[PDB]
């Protein structure tokens, strides 16, 4: 099947955009709910939505990098590693955004009462990008290990 | 923005000595810094300084400052209650009574000419007697308008039940809206009058079966009395002994019976109460309006004199030497109190000290949070200099 | 090309119209519910629907661009990148709209008593179009890599 490798290029940005959208919605819900109780730390509590929304750049850059090397026809060899790397990057970005949404909402609600928990919520929230970075690195290595395009 | 009142003219009262300098523009006086250093150049400066009022020792000033703050809070609550009653009366707009002229003079021209002038206070009298008499006169003037508003609300509440009982719906109706003798009994020894509410569908069945439903009943008594849009109200004349059997037999027919008896004094008193309730509500409304305005003017003048005394007491207690300080009232427009409070706090905050100032600008007046209150009576924050906010 | 080549054109506008409709409904519900208590946030509530309409306009432009490159016959490799780019753009627009609507309703509801979170809700709403821009760019690259059908 020629041109079958587009599902791996679209699924990474789709899963990363859905996980970043769900994480930005879950962080914005807890930020908007926690902003009524204490509006002094609104700028400190707004970091989890912007940090969760940056997870889509890995799948978008991976889909743009895979789209930049794709022509009009492809063999069956690229359409097995491409869908696996794109599905792994999409699942890693969706899981990282899904954990970053509840971690951002619980970190904003816990950081709303006490201001000392912002360093712990930022430290625990900063570790969620390791799955998307590892999936983007595995998708970059699997995409770089492909050939026979055309 | 919902941190202040944006439907009236706001004023900021500041007091400082003759040796202070601003921190926002060096090499300038406080008089030129008040008008020229203001945000946007729209701040109007007015004269608000006052002379000494025979202030005693420093130990009595701390006890007098709490009574002046409590009297200023009570006069501010009474002025807001009188203005809230006048705005709630539906006689003025939301901006009236807070930006309009008082005694034919505007708020900036009247505030600029406020040189500690009163008709019951003088410069040689004590501040405790005028502070107590101003709070007593403001409390009595607010209590008179509150009692007049409560009497007008009770007169309107009685006039609503009298107007609803006079005519309209058949759920609560009394036969007192007709003075004709054909709808009731006149010169009878055993006959009574009873009203029966029937629907529009069963109106012909209630009139056809009303004579045969209860024995010993007057025929042809059922006529069109009153009905709004859903029922017809008819009158029934019969004996007083068969009234319970006619009402119990009429209740089984799916009809709505109305208990009543023949009496002209009940309709005369029912018409007299609704006849007098509108005049009592009108006189209580007019007297409540005139007493509300006349108490509101003296409440505003007493609140301005209490704020002028508290500003001189806090300025005299905070600065010390010299005894005469330059105090003025700055008229700021709405939505610009945060820039004037931040510029005046950053400019005059270094006069009180280096540890009393704070970097918090604005206030929070939300329903789920009462923090960031700009004042010297809370533990969340304090003011770095002599400055008070007035929200009319 | 066997079949199912026209689904990628409507797959973007379906999810984008559903996401923009749910975000516009969730913004108008909190705007109409918050307009009764405070009339100051009435004009501020139009930014979520007006900013939400650009995500549906981008999916409509991508659906028009994918519809103009279809004709009556599909290529062998077009029916994978077309449905992948359409599904990615539709899921990105639906996730952006669904993530934007709850944050707009929560921000509009919380900003009724005291407007302090309006800059935060406008900041998150201004930055919430990155998923639609990334999905529109990935759909533009995938649509650009699938031209010349036949």
From Swiss-Prot, chains A, C:
Membrane-spanning intervals of the chain: 1-23, 46-66, 83-104, 117-142
Subcellular location, record wording: Vacuole membrane
Keywords on record: Hydrogen ion transport, Ion transport, Membrane, Transmembrane, Transmembrane helix, Transport, Vacuole
GO biological process per UniProt: endocytosis; endosomal lumen acidification; Golgi lumen acidification; intracellular copper ion homeostasis; intracellular iron ion homeostasis; protein targeting to vacuole; proton transmembrane transport; vacuolar acidification
Vacuolar side: 67-82, 143-150
GO molecular function: proton transmembrane transporter activity; proton-transporting ATPase activity, rotational mechanism
Domain of life (superkingdom): Eukaryota
Oligomeric and partner information: V-ATPase is a heteromultimeric enzyme composed of a peripheral catalytic V1 complex (components A to H) attached to an integral membrane V0 proton pore complex (components: a, c, c', c'', d, e, f and VOA1). The decameric c-ring forms the proton-conducting pore, and is composed of eight proteolipid subunits c, one subunit c' and one subunit c''.
Job description of the protein: Proton-conducting pore forming subunit of the V0 complex of vacuolar(H+)-ATPase (V-ATPase), a multisubunit enzyme composed of a peripheral complex (V1) that hydrolyzes ATP and a membrane integral complex (V0) that translocates protons. V-ATPase is responsible for acidifying and maintaining the pH of intracellular compartments.
Family as reported in the entry's similarity comment: Belongs to the V-ATPase proteolipid subunit family.
Remarks, miscellaneous: Present with 8450 molecules/cell in log phase SD medium.
Name of the protein this chain belongs to: V-type proton ATPase subunit c
Taxonomic lineage of the native organism: Eukaryota, Fungi, Dikarya, Ascomycota, Saccharomycotina
Gene name of the encoded protein: VMA3
UniProtKB/Swiss-Prot annotation, chain B:
GO cellular component labels: fungal-type vacuole membrane; Golgi membrane; proton-transporting V-type ATPase complex; vacuolar proton-transporting V-type ATPase complex; vacuolar proton-transporting V-type ATPase, V1 domain
One annotated GO biological process: vacuolar acidification
Keywords of the record: Acetylation, ATP-binding, Hydrogen ion transport, Ion transport, Membrane, Nucleotide-binding, Transport, Vacuole
Known function: Subunit of the V1 complex of vacuolar(H+)-ATPase (V-ATPase), a multisubunit enzyme composed of a peripheral complex (V1) that hydrolyzes ATP and a membrane integral complex (V0) that translocates protons. V-ATPase is responsible for acidifying and maintaining the pH of intracellular compartments. Subunit C is necessary for the assembly of the catalytic sector of the enzyme and is likely to have a specific function in its catalytic activity. Reversibly leaves the enzyme after glucose depletion, causing the catalytic subcomplex V1 to detach from the V0 section.
PANTHER family: V-TYPE PROTON ATPASE SUBUNIT C (PTHR10137:SF0)
Any further remark recorded for this protein: Present with 21114 molecules/cell in log phase SD medium.
The protein's name in its UniProt record: V-type proton ATPase subunit C
Source organism: Saccharomyces cerevisiae (strain ATCC 204508 / S288c)
